[PDB]
Amino acid sequence: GPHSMRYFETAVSRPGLEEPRYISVGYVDNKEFVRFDSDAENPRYEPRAPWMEQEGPEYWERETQKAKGQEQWFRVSLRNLLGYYNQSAGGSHTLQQMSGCDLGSDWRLLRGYLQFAYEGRDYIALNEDLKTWTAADMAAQITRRKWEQSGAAEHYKAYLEGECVEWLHRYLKNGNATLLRTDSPKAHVTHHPRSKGEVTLRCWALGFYPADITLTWQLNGEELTQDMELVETRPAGDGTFQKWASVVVPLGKEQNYTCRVYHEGLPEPLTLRWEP
């Protein structure tokens, strides 16, 4: 299947003892594999997965250096943003950055990603062409202008199309004990008395990965996309995920209701019904 690598970087400031905390988490196929925390005793990208442990100091050293580098960049962009929004000093602010690349099932590039966020809101992001920007607001305009007159977009275009892809391949080649794998959702429904002559059916999906998944209830072919109960997909804590959907079905008329469970790891969608 397809793959990807992202580096989510956050810099968060608090008042008093200046110097914001810088954090960088990187993922390959949305699985954490490296982490950096300026708050550590000894700041330095740590491996975060058995496989990635086969890298060697030369590497970690080079990465830790880069993280030290980002830290400074954020540290300053943060002082600048502070001025752009005319926010009084002594506050607590956040600068966020998502960067990375996507690969087809063939391993070739498909897209580059580089976007920023200030205070949790979109600030400026590199467009698909990797040549033009998009500034969410007036303050971001200033930033965008500055970044155009310096062709800084080329710099990111180079990394996203190159190093990003070159290393993802490398990573994909090493760690091959879960990355060339996924978990199929096991399913089942549960009966719950709900009211006067009515009940509630709960379509449960458990132990699946990746987290993308879809549940739906049907009453005579038609999908019940109303009065249905969901729940944001959540981590079982072991690496797999869970989610459930439910509906209120007049007692005795259980069988007239079925739920399909759509998920990539699944050969074909699952079909469920209450089993008394």
């Binding site: 990208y45 880069k66 580098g69 980002q70 300053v76 962009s77 752009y84 990111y156 290393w167």
Partner: peptide, 10 residues
């Protein structure tokens, strides 16, 4: 490997 931002900052 980590990305390093442009010299151009916010």
């Amino acid at each position: 490997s980590a990305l390093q931002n442009a010299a151009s900052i916010a």
